[PDB]
Structure formats: structure tokens, C-alpha cells
Design a protein around this nucleic acid. Structure first.
Ligand SMILES: [Mg+2]
Ligand SMILES: [Mg+2]
Ligand SMILES: [Mg+2]
Ligand SMILES: [Mg+2]
Ligand SMILES: [Mg+2]
Ligand SMILES: [Mg+2]
Ligand SMILES: [Mg+2]
Length: 226
RNA sequence: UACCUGGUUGAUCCUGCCAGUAGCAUAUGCUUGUCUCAAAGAUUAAGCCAUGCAUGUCUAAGUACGCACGGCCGGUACAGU
């Protein structure tokens, strides 16, 4: 037998500071709104808990002189059940590679979701902090806080991203052509993504400004991989 | 539990309806071991009705010559039922 796998020779400055243990968590990446362009940055921090799920396989096709040329579109949702979630979609000629290329995008689009309390703050937030809305081409999704223990009152499809994001209680609503899974899923993901981009009176303390990870580790980047 | 799913296209995004889904109450089909509770000729013809019953009543205190019984001897407000 043989061993010593040496995958993930990085190609970006962030891959270097992630593979080298210099960077601690992807919260430090989100604080600086950097773009994550390598799917191994995710598996470094998360990975032992990220569970993926194939939401739908959808055969699309173009008419052609000879034929109808079909290829399949895979919608995959991913995320550990403790505050991170993502959703990718890839169109490929065969199913087995669409479902594999979609996991890469679902991992690259992982965002942090915010959770809050409904009535009073006893510990371990359980629901969304406020009423949020999200759209994707005539699909509107409304998320509303709920008391503890109510579960997720929603359709099957939003109650597969809402669970993965870490929310225990939620009242949901939709008013649209919700039968198209692509727009339904993208609008739910958008509503979840708008949960950290909502100014709330606890977010009024002035910002303490830290060093960027590229400024703090200039000395490393100068010659850590070459 | 503040929820959706299939169907117009070669394929996509919509309007929009048809169909699906859960309860409720009238009928009907198949099937039915135990136990408590209990709706029931309203819908249509406030159409027609054989027969039986459903409203009677007395205390010491309105009228007692039924011998209808009956008393200790008879009626003298007159025995009593
Ligand atoms: Mg439809
Ligand atoms: Mg047409
Ligand atoms: Mg067709
Ligand atoms: Mg119907
Ligand atoms: Mg018995
Ligand atoms: Mg009648
Ligand atoms: Mg008669």
C-alpha cells in the first residue's frame, strides 16, 4: 500500500494563510468580507460536520439541427447545523459530475446566519432576529420569529435550508410561483443571507478596527510557500 | 403548525386556472369482538290518515232518604264508608 496524500497546494494568498495555521476561523474571513475562491478553506475550518443534500435534479435542453441536446442541473444544499449554510447549482452533461461540481459551489457560498430570541433572552438563540424577506424572480419568502418549540412552519423546500442553517423555530410565508425549486431555494437562501446585514439597535456600538489578515501576515506571505 | 404539490413548452421565466390536500354534515358501499355516552320523517308533500291512548278533579270542613254495604237502637243538624 501507499500513503502520504499531499493535495491542496494553494494558489491564492488566502489559501496560504489558511493551510498554514496562521488564520484561526472563517469568522475572521467574513469580518473582512474577503472572497473565498478555494473549496479547501471551507473543509479546513468546517468539514467534520458539513452535510450536503441534493435538492433537485432537473433535465434542461437546447434544440439543435440534429437533435434535442439534454444536460442535467443539480441543486445542492450544504451546511453544518450550527450557523452556516450554502446552496450551489451546476449544469453538466451527466448527473454524477453535476452533483459533484455543485457541492464545490455550495461550499464556496457558505454564509453565516444570525439567530436571536423571540420573547426573552434565556440562552442559546433559537430563531431569526427580525422579520426578513427575500426574492428571486417573482418568488418572495418571508421569515418571522416564533416562540420556542414551534418548529419550522414552512414548505418542504425552505424547511431543508432553514434546518441546516441552525434555526429551530420560524414562521414562514410565500406568495409566488413557488413550484420552481430554483427560485424558491435561492429566495430562501437570500432571506437567510440578509440576517447579518440588518442594522439592529444592539449593532450601534462604534467599530473597533483591526489589522486585515493580509497586513498582519505580510512577513509570512513574503516567503511562506516560495 | 402563519406550509403547499402535478398540468400549457424542444427547454426557461410568469399570469392564470383545473387537479391534488385537511376538516365538517347528509346519503350510500364493504366490514364489525368489548364498554360508556346518545342524534334520529327538518330538507320533498304546513301531503292524507285505519286503530288505542294523550285532562281531569274530594277534605274533618258545598248538597247523601242508592239496603250499595253497615252498626248493637234509633236518625231527634244525623253513624260510618
Ligand atoms: Mg403551477
Ligand atoms: Mg401556449
Ligand atoms: Mg411537453
Ligand atoms: Mg379543489
Ligand atoms: Mg363483559
Ligand atoms: Mg314535514
Ligand atoms: Mg282515533
Amino acid at each position: 500500500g501507499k500513503a502520504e496524500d499531499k493535495e491542496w497546494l494553494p494558489v491564492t494568498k488566502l489559501g496560504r494563510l489558511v493551510k498554514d495555521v496562521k488564520i484561526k476561523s472563517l469568522e475572521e474571513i467574513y469580518l473582512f468580507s474577503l472572497p473565498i475562491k478555494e473549496s479547501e478553506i471551507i473543509d479546513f475550518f468546517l468539514g467534520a460536520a458539513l452535510k450536503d443534500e441534493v435538492l433537485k435534479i432537473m433535465p434542461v435542453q437546447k434544440q439543435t439541427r440534429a437533435a434535442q441536446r439534454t444536460r442535467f442541473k443539480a441543486f445542492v444544499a450544504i451546511g453544518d447545523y450550527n450557523g452556516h449554510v450554502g446552496l450551489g447549482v451546476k449544469c453538466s452533461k451527466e448527473v454524477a459530475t453535476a452533483i459533484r461540481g455543485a457541492i464545490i459551489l455550495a461550499k464556496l457560498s457558505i454564509v453565516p446566519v444570525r439567530r436571536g430570541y423571540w420573547g426573552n433572552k434565556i440562552g442559546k438563540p433559537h430563531t431569526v432576529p427580525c422579520k426578513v424577506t427575500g426574492r428571486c424572480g417573482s418568488v418572495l419568502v418571508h421569515l418571522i420569529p416564533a416562540p420556542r418549540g414551534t418548529g419550522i412552519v414552512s414548505a418542504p423546500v425552505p424547511k431543508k435550508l432553514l434546518l441546516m442553517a441552525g434555526i429551530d423555530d420560524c414562521y414562514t410565508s410565500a406568495w409566488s410561483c413557488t413550484a420552481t425549486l430554483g427560485n424558491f431555494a435561492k429566495a430562501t437562501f437570500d432571506a437567510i443571507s440578509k440576517t447579518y446585514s440588518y442594522l439592529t439597535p444592539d449593532l450601534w456600538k462604534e467599530t473597533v478596527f483591526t489589522k486585515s489578515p493580509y497586513q498582519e501576515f505580510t512577513d509570512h506571505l513574503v516567503k511562506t510557500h516560495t
